[PDB]
């Protein structure tokens, strides 16, 4: 049977679950999902029941989503409650630190300041800010209130033990835990900042806009970002302490039943959701408050399947809570992420030769690696510009570029015999790409071509081709050479994958190859001993220039599609400085003074350059590059990008 066993934590919740059960039976057909109702004493008892295969689903706040993730529960987010309009679904809130403009201090200078909290034990007002500050607090850190009382000079921390720690209630004597206290709650803590009582208020992004209508007033405030800078209040998305999901349905990581859970809930909102006015209303609690779901919910969004709990909660939230739960405080080694059995081996060699300054983490895919850098399991890796885009939108930034001598050149290579082909009209021809979503083989050439055909349905523009990463049924997988499941994969087991592979695809099957300016020189004239390249001459090939003409291969400077941004090392913002130093020190020892091919870094890289000003993916890639990728995103199929675009569009 297709049964979703929902877990309730109270008799009122269980009664609603039963009404939920009986009404869905009148709406869902025989082959569809039905609900069962398991009543337990608490949210943690529900988490344990789900993990024990005695129930299937429960909706949790962020704190318990974290608890549900830890072993041995290992639950996962599947469906997201959303609020507000259908056009702009508000799935998360942002915990921010608001300050007065020109007060002259950053997040890392809060010791001694006066703080305004919404209330002790609340998320944005306490657990998150104190969670992040935890190791900055003085020892002993237990009890936590004593440590905070000895960190801020004074504060208003409603519901704090002012008798034993009167510093915490200096700004609100008694620290009344009710609205009788002027500085209690979300309006109160911001009022505690506005009135001049405190120097910082830990609140939600929307508190400022709800308590100050005129933007002129809002300009007198700023936000403290975790990189120790400030930003205006309406840039909370790029300057917050944490992005927190409001209410989240969780299920087992393996054993589900994510498929049924979404079918059940999506059906339920379509017939009993907001503005549906039936006997049974999914988001009403006739004899309670927020039973099973929050009464203010407007519907449900499916959580993208690539996303786990650490990625859904976010790096900084996980850091804050882990500090509160465990209470553990210490440049540290840089954990590099390797993708192959050949790449890991190089990493282990590199690790022992670094006297411990480099450690090694592994994963199957680049996206898996990028996810491990986001959550802290890994620290750094080198990426093609196309993956830097993914990494940037996922939160990471570039810290070092690999220089090869401004970046490398992207060109279109054809066979010289074929005198007919031009850049003007390539429709109906056979294309060879390094892979989908890569700088030289896709983002640059297909970005330009998008502007000339007005769509990204490129399998209907070219007759066929090989663009590793495309869907296996696509005409852009027909020319690939991989065998079995390897066919058309964007990895080594597909022989037409990469710069060289795409050129090989041209030699043997295709009409045009989109690669970089050195690819042809390195695979002709005997440079590449493989049979497919051994006897090739670089004079039998030429490049397609944008004006519509063709030029020889070694004249790439005058005949090129666009300058491609170099590959770059990406990391988290909180480890940018440390990766920048250890690697600049590492190439000084092992630089210009790989067993297989392009392990960790490309093999034609001389050094690792600094960027200074270009420490974000938009600054590094360029404006025109980012807009091209935006146009190509309409037809793109990246699941990692889908997940971290669910948090940050
Ligand atoms: O919240 C509660 O537990 C009390 N109930 C009364 C009851 O048990 O029916 C709320 C109400 O129904 O108004
Ligand atoms: O390559 C250069 O140095 C200048 N480019 C612009 C560019 O590469 O985007 C001229 C051109 O490509 O037509
Ligand atoms: Fe590249
Ligand atoms: Na919390
Ligand atoms: Ru009751
Ligand atoms: Ru119907
Ligand atoms: Ru009743
Ligand atoms: Ru150019």
First to last CA, the chain: 38
Structure tokens at 595: 């067993």
CA neighbor of 548 nearest in space, from 443, 426, 461: 426
Kindly state the tokens that stand for 141: 């850190």
Tokens representing 175 are 């620290």
Q: How far is the CA of 286 from the centre of ligand 7 (A)?
A: 7
Q: Tell me how far apart the alpha carbons of residues 607 and 625 are, in angstroms, rounded to a whole number.
A: 24
Phi, psi of 166 (to 5 degrees): -65, -20
Q: Which residues, other chains included, contact 259 with Cβ-Cβ below 8 Å and sequence gap of 6+?
A: none
* Residue minimizing CA distance to atom 2 of ligand 2: 563
Residue 387 CA to residue 339 CA, distance in Å, equals 14
Strand partners, 59: 249
C-alpha–C-alpha distance, residues 501 and 62, integer Å: 46
Atom of ligand 2 nearest to the CA of 561: 12
Q: Which residues are within 8 A (CB) of 349 and not within 5 positions of it... i.e. 6 or more apart?
A: none
Indicate which residue's Cα is closest to atom 12 of ligand 1. Answer: 287
Query: In terms of residues, how long is the chain?
Result: 649
Where do the domains of the chain lie, and which CATH numbers do they carry? 1-92+245-330 (3.40.190.10), 93-244 (3.40.190.10), 331-407+565-649 (3.40.190.10), 408-564 (3.40.190.10)
CA angle (630 as vertex; 392, 389 as ends), nearest 5: 20
Which single residue is written with the structure tokens 């100050």? 212
Of 38, 68, 30, residue with least CA distance to 51: 68
By three-state DSSP, how is residue 125 classified?
A: helix
DSSP 8-state assignment for residue 204: E
Q: CA 82, 85, 88: angle at the middle one, nearest 5?
A: 80
Q: Are 579 and 610 in contact (CB under 8 A)?
A: no
At CA 68, angle to CA 397 and CA 291, rounded to 5? Answer: 110
**Ligand 1 atom with least separation from CA of 289:** 1
Q: Please state, in angstroms and rounded to a whole number, the distance separating the CA atoms of residues 83 and 299.
A: 7
Residue 300, strand partner residues:
81
Q: Are 302 and 644 in contact (CB under 8 A)?
A: no
CA distance 8 to 362: 40
Cα–Cα–Cα angle for 612, 618, 623, rounded to 5 degrees: 115
Query: How close is the Cα of 629 to the center of ligand 3, in Å?
Result: 14
Nearby residues for ligand 4 (ion, Cβ within 5 Å) = 63, 123, 127
Q: Is 118 assigned a ligand-binding role in the annotation?
A: yes
15 among the known binding-site residues?
no
Nearest Cα neighbor of 550 from 558, 507, 524 is 558
Question: DSSP assignment, residue 266?
Answer: H
Helices (H), 70-200: 128-133, 144-149, 185-194
Tokens 């690999």, located at residue: 402
93 is known to lie in a ligand binding site = yes
* Alpha carbon distances (Å) from 224 to 124, 202, 216, 232, 611: 14, 10, 19, 9, 24
Count CB-CB contacts under 10 A for residue 263. Answer: 16
**Cβ-Cβ contacts under 8 Å for 254 (sequence gap 6 or more):** none
């Amino acid at each position: 049977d297709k049964t979703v066993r929902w877990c309730a934590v109270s008799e009122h919740e269980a009664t609603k679950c039963q009404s939920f059960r009986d009404h869905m039976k009148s709406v869902i057909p025989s082959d569809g999902p039905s609900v069962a109702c398991v009543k337990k004493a608490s949210y943690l008892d529900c988490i344990r029941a789900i993990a024990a295969n005695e129930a299937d689903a429960v909706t949790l706040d962020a704190g318990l989503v974290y608890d549900a993730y830890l072993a041995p529960n290992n639950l996962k987010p599947v469906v997201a409650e959303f609020y507000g309009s259908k056009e702009d679904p508000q799935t998360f809130y942002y915990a921010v630190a608001v300050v007065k403009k020109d007060s002259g201090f950053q997040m890392n200078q809060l010791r001694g300041k006066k703080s305004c909290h919404t209330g002790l034990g609340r998320s944005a007002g306490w657990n998150i800010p104190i969670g992040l500050l935890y190791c900055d607090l003085p020892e002993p850190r237990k009890p936590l209130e004593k440590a905070v009382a000895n960190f801020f000079s004074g504060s208003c921390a409603p519901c704090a033990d002012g008798t034993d720690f009167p510093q915490l209630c200096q700004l609100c004597p008694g620290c009344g835990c009710s609205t009788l206290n002027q500085y209690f709650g979300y309006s109160g803590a911001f009022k505690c900042l506005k009135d001049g009582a405190g120097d910082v208020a830990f609140v939600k992004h929307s508190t400022i806009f709800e308590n100050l209508a005129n933007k002129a007033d809002r300009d007198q405030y700023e936000l403290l970002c975790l990189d120790n800078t400030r930003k205006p209040v309406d840039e909370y998305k790029d300057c917050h302490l944490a992005q927190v999901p409001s209410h989240t349905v969780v299920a087992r990581s393996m054993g589900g039943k994510e498929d049924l859970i979404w079918e059940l809930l999506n059906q339920a909102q379509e017939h009993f959701g907001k503005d549906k006015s039936k006997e049974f209303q999914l988001f009403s609690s006739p004899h309670g408050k927020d039973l099973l779901f929050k009464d203010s919910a407007h519907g449900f969004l499916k959580v993208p399947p690539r996303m786990d709990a650490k990625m859904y909660l976010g790096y900084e939230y996980v850091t804050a809570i882990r500090n509160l739960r465990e209470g553990t405080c210490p440049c540290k080694p840089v954990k590099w992420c390797a993708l192959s059995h050949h790449e890991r081996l190089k990493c282990d060699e590199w690790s022992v030769n670094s006297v411990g300054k480099i450690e090694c983490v592994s994963a199957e895919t680049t996206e898996d690696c990028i996810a491990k850098i986001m959550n802290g399991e890994a620290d750094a890796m080198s990426l093609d510009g196309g993956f830097v885009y993914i990494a940037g939108k996922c939160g990471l930034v570039p810290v070092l570029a690999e220089n090869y001598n401004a970046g490398y050149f992207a060109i279109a290579v054809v066979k010289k015999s074929a005198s007919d082909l031009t850049w003007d009209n390539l429709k109906g021809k056979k294309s060879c790409h390094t892979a989908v979503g890569r700088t030289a083989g896709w983002n640059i050439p297909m970005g330009l071509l998008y502007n000339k055909i007005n769509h990204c349905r490129f399998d209907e523009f070219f007759s066929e081709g090989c663009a590793p990463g495309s869907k296996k049924d696509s005409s852009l997988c027909k020319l690939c050479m991989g065998s079995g499941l390897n066919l058309c994969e964007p990895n080594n087991k597909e022989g037409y994958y990469g710069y060289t592979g795409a050129f090989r695809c041209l030699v043997e099957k295709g009409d045009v190859a989109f690669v970089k300016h050195q690819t042809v020189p390195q695979n002709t004239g005997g440079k590449n001993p493989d049979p497919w390249a051994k006897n090739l001459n670089e004079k039998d090939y030429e490049l397609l220039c944008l004006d519509g003409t063709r030029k020889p291969v070694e004249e790439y400077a005058n005949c090129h599609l666009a300058r491609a941004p170099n590959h770059a090392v990406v990391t988290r913002k909180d480890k940018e400085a440390c990766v920048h130093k250890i690697l600049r020190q590492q190439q000084h020892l092992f630089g210009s003074n790989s067993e297989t091919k392009d392990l960790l870094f490309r093999d034609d890289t001389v050094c690792l350059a600094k960027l200074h000003d270009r420490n974000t993916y938009e600054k590094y890639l360029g404006e025109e590059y980012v807009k091209a990728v935006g146009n190509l995103r309409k037809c793109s199929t990246s699941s990692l990008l889908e997940a971290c675009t669910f948090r940050r569009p």
